[PDB]
Design an enzyme around this catalytic site. Sequence first.
Site, PDB file in Angstrom:
ATOM      1  N   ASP A  43      75.234  53.381  -3.719  1.00 13.23           N
ATOM      2  CA  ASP A  43      74.332  54.729  -3.209  1.00 13.23           C
ATOM      3  C   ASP A  43      74.167  56.118  -3.993  1.00 13.23           C
ATOM      4  OD1 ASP A  43      73.258  52.360  -0.764  1.00 13.23           O
ATOM      5  OD2 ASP A  43      74.622  53.651   0.508  1.00 13.23           O
ATOM      6  N   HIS A  81      75.146  52.893   4.752  1.00 12.56           N
ATOM      7  CA  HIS A  81      74.488  51.997   4.140  1.00 12.56           C
ATOM      8  C   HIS A  81      73.727  51.448   4.956  1.00 12.56           C
ATOM      9  CE1 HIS A  81      74.881  50.958   0.442  1.00 12.56           C
ATOM     10  NE2 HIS A  81      75.942  49.639   0.251  1.00 12.56           N
ATOM     11  N   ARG A 108      73.818  39.712   2.884  1.00  8.67           N
ATOM     12  CA  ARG A 108      72.429  39.727   2.923  1.00  8.67           C
ATOM     13  C   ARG A 108      71.560  38.846   2.006  1.00  8.67           C
ATOM     14  NH1 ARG A 108      68.605  44.482   2.093  1.00  8.67           N
ATOM     15  NH2 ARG A 108      69.299  45.633   0.526  1.00  8.67           N
ATOM     16  N   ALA A 143      87.040  35.189  -3.846  1.00  6.29           N
ATOM     17  CA  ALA A 143      86.352  34.476  -4.942  1.00  6.29           C
ATOM     18  C   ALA A 143      84.613  34.445  -4.802  1.00  6.29           C
ATOM     19  CB  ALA A 143      86.490  32.901  -4.873  1.00  6.29           C
ATOM     20  N   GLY A 144      84.275  35.702  -4.313  1.00  7.98           N
ATOM     21  CA  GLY A 144      82.963  35.905  -4.662  1.00  7.98           C
ATOM     22  C   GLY A 144      82.523  36.421  -5.231  1.00  7.98           C
ATOM     23  N   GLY A 173      87.172  38.598   0.074  1.00  6.86           N
ATOM     24  CA  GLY A 173      86.859  37.159  -0.587  1.00  6.86           C
ATOM     25  C   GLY A 173      87.232  37.706  -1.851  1.00  6.86           C
ATOM     26  N   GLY A 228      83.915  40.415  -6.120  1.00  9.23           N
ATOM     27  CA  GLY A 228      85.703  39.543  -6.521  1.00  9.23           C
ATOM     28  C   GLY A 228      85.279  39.679  -8.532  1.00  9.23           C
ATOM     29  N   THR A 252      83.410  47.117   2.061  1.00  7.03           N
ATOM     30  CA  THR A 252      82.357  46.784   1.029  1.00  7.03           C
ATOM     31  C   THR A 252      81.485  46.195   1.847  1.00  7.03           C
ATOM     32  OG1 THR A 252      82.967  47.487  -1.085  1.00  7.03           O
ATOM     33  CG2 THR A 252      81.706  46.078  -0.947  1.00  7.03           C
ATOM     34  N   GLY A 253      82.398  45.321   2.725  1.00  9.87           N
ATOM     35  CA  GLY A 253      80.944  43.883   3.518  1.00  9.87           C
ATOM     36  C   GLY A 253      80.336  44.821   4.161  1.00  9.87           C
ATOM     37  N   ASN A 254      78.991  44.032   4.285  1.00 11.61           N
ATOM     38  CA  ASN A 254      77.941  44.845   5.045  1.00 11.61           C
ATOM     39  C   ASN A 254      77.574  44.581   6.954  1.00 11.61           C
ATOM     40  OD1 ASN A 254      76.565  46.713   3.862  1.00 11.61           O
ATOM     41  ND2 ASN A 254      75.317  45.606   2.893  1.00 11.61           N
TER      42      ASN A 254
HETATM   43 NA    NA Z   1      67.657  47.903   0.444  1.00  8.99          NA
HETATM   44 NA    NA Z   2      84.054  34.373  -1.255  1.00  6.25          NA
END
Ligand code: NA
Ligand code: NA
Lengths: 328, 317
Positions: free
Chosen positions: A158, A186, A91, A12-13, A10, A16, A128-130
């Site tokens: 957290d 998490h 999200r 370019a997000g 990810g 990142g 790290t991705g949910n």
């Molecule tokens: Na929350």
């Molecule tokens: Na991305």
Amino acid sequence: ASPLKVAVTGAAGQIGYSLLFRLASGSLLGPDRPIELRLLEIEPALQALEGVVMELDDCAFPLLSGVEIGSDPQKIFDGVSLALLVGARPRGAGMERSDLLEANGAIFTAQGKALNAVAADDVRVGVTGNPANTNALIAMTNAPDIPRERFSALTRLDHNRAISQLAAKTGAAVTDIKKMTIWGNHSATQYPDLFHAEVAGKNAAEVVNDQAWIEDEFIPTVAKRGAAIIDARGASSAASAASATIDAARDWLLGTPADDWVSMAVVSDGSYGVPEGLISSFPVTTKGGNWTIVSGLEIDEFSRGRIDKSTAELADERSAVTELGLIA
Amino acid sequence: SPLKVAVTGAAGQIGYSLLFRLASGSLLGPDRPIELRLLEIEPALQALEGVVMELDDCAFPLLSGVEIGSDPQKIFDGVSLALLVGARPLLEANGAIFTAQGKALNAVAADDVRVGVTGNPANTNALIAMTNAPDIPRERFSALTRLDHNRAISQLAAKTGAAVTDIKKMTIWGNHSATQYPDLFHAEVAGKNAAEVVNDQAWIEDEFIPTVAKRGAAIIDARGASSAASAASATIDAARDWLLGTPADDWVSMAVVSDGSYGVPEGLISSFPVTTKGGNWTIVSGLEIDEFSRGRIDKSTAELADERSAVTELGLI
Ligand code: NA
Ligand code: NA
Ligand code: NA
Ligand code: NA
Ligand code: NA
Ligand code: NA
Ligand code: NA
Ligand code: NA
Ligand code: NA
Ligand code: NA
Ligand code: NA
Ligand code: NA
Ligand code: NA
Ligand code: NA
Ligand code: NA
Ligand code: NA
Ligand code: NA
Ligand code: NA
Ligand code: NA
Ligand code: NA
Ligand code: NA
Ligand code: NA
């Protein structure tokens, strides 16, 4: 030193965008340890990733030994010693992190298989991705030739949040706070545990001296913080998630201080009554790139109930990804 | 004792990329705490609260505290470094911002304040701020040409295959604009004269200089958004080198007030090769300016003088 080969998905997000400049500047391994960045994006984001790499080059970072970019995980993960799996759908407001279980899950099946095929023998894999714990479980199970303990999900944001709120309540510096623990998922069922934490050599729960504040304010403030950032900022955390990703990876690779421990979601051996095989947040110490769950903590009845609620959630998530065929 | 650092435009994109690096140690290193004082316009204060929530969530050991607000006389009170990032995305609109900010600094900043201007048009904003702060020494004001400098290093490293650590003595002369002059004739690639290493004057004029000058637009074309992280990085580099000093075998670019050196009109904020020590810059003395470089330097300083005239006519000086 030979450059440490670090993959970031990810790339370019928003996470990142924060994370890559901290990595290249020296935040992970310090001012004398070069890094090679290996950056993954989906095909439609590769033009933007080219732009990010232009910016990295334009920082004239002495530690950045080189950059490779691409969309093929087998190419990008080849020979990597640290893989930061950050890229997944985010999200938004009104969503639970578990809403993305089926959507993001298949990313991690594929990435686990790629890591298994090509990563360096010494690889450590941070997710790290949910929903992070379950995504790390997916990746770990799809990499049978990498030791299970090499996979972790990030509960350090957290953990850091909980440090910040405790320091604020007590009038203490963050540097005074030790032995914070986040247990479980998490998610909103995470259990931040003051009962084993310290504020400058004093038990944290005793210093706060206010069970009601713990239950009614501290725990939900930490648990729901991500939603609070979405409400305040209009978008998920980015810089702070990147910072927590650096802290967790740094402590994993370089070790924890002698007087302290950190929170990492890692595979359960049944410790503390946490079902075996879940990726669940534990108090851990680290050395040599290896973690050890902190032994001997007395779990009081209040803590026990909150831990079990969270691990119950994890068990439910694990069942759901098993039913979707994402595991193994 | 924490260094009090003000940052304007703090909920903008450069700010977002800057504040976490500041708080993590990038400015003064791992043992020197910082206090952040963050300025925004009133309509951006809600957003700035969200940035401070994320700062706090980092549990940064060096971050002694954070104050936010829209009044520069409160935010700049006692500050020792002021990073003037925020600006209107031209000369006149920014004129009021920088007049007001220079006056505030003059009133309430620490005696030891250094003031770095990143917001565009940077040289002329810095000139306006400095002129409005008659009780702060003129040498405390600088505009950022470090991003151009680092972009030049990046192009020269790509062309030569050298490591960026092998590139020294890069200079950007003049304005932070399309008339900037990146000077290879005094730069060194592993000890060797950069212009002799490249050996290609057409490449200098037709590729190197315009690629540097137009780089911001190239990033926008690629990413769909401006170069915030690399601007932040340059801001840190410049402020760090200003406060802690340059390496003994190297120099940096900073736009600072001209005393006439190298034929640059006195009183312009113009980018010079400089060394730093003790929080003070010194223009690098003794450089021979060849005919090609003279022509390009004078084109840039002509633009700087034109901008100074324009802001003088508008009543801002
Ligand atoms: Na929350
Ligand atoms: Na991305
Ligand atoms: Na970002
Ligand atoms: Na490093
Ligand atoms: Na930089
Ligand atoms: Na830069
Ligand atoms: Na590449
Ligand atoms: Na495994
Ligand atoms: Na509660
Ligand atoms: Na909250
Ligand atoms: Na909150
Ligand atoms: Na079990
Ligand atoms: Na399992
Ligand atoms: Na359950
Ligand atoms: Na501002
Ligand atoms: Na900006
Ligand atoms: Na710093
Ligand atoms: Na906060
Ligand atoms: Na954090
Ligand atoms: Na000056
Ligand atoms: Na500056
Ligand atoms: Na001088």
